[PDB]
């Protein structure tokens, strides 16, 4: 498993953030840099066990059979969420970055650009 599917560019996230979090982005960038590099290394999982070999060749062949029906049944989970509240914070921070600031910016850039049509006089 590689980087989580969503990829935003490393300079477009990494220059710009709300004023409330301004210094925390440049740290969180480096924290996500070490995590994305640290996770990109790993073969996700080992091989299986050759069982008929292990049962023949460990001459304690009945200790072996416990560990078959145990290991063949005993399956590992992937770790869970605890911080996808960053996606709700991202929808709220897009309502802020887009809609709230976008429409407010479109009336303020127009406040100047309508004064630039007045400056044509």
Partner 1 sequence: QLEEVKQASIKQIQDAIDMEKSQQALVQKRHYLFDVQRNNIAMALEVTYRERLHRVYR
By the criterion CB under 8 A, which residues form the site for partner 1?
1-10, 12-18, 25, 28-29, 31-32, 35-36, 38-39, 42-47, 49, 74, 76-81, 83-84, 86-87, 90, 93-94, 96-98, 101-102, 105-106, 108-109, 112-113, 115-116, 119
How far apart CA 56 and CA 117 sit, in angstroms, is: 90
52 or 74, CB closer to partner 1? 74
Q: Least distance (Å) from partner 1 to the CB of residue 27?
A: 12
Q: Whole-number minimum distance, CB 55 to partner 1, in Å?
A: 16
Considering the complex, state which of residue 36 and residue 68 has its C-beta at the smaller distance from partner 1: 36
CB of 117 to partner 1, least distance (A): 10
- Least distance in Å: CB of 53 to partner 1? 14
Give whichever of 49 and 56 is closer to partner 1, judged by the CB atom. 49
Measure the CA–CA gap between 99 and 112, rounded to whole angstroms.
20
Cα(92)–Cα(85) distance, integer angstroms: 10
Concatenated DSSP letters for 5-41?
Answer: S----TTTTTS---GGGHHHHHHHHHHHHHHHHHHHT
Contact partners, residue 44, CB within 8 Å, separation at least 6: 1
């Amino acid at each position: 498993r590689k980087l989580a599917l969503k990829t935003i560019d490393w300079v477009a996230f990494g220059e710009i953030i709300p004023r409330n979090q301004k210094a925390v982005a440049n740290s969180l960038k480096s924290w996500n840099e070490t995590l994305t590099s640290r996770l990109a290394t790993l073969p996700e999982k080992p091989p299986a066990i050759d069982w008929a070999y292990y049962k023949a060749n460990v001459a304690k062949a009945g200790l072996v059979d416990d560990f078959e029906k145990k290991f063949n049944a005993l399956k590992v989970p992937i770790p869970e969420d605890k911080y996808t509240a960053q996606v709700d914070a991202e929808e709220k921070e897009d309502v802020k970055s887009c809609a709230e600031f976008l429409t407010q910016s479109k009336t303020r850039i127009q406040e100047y650009e309508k004064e630039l049509e007045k400056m044509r006089n």
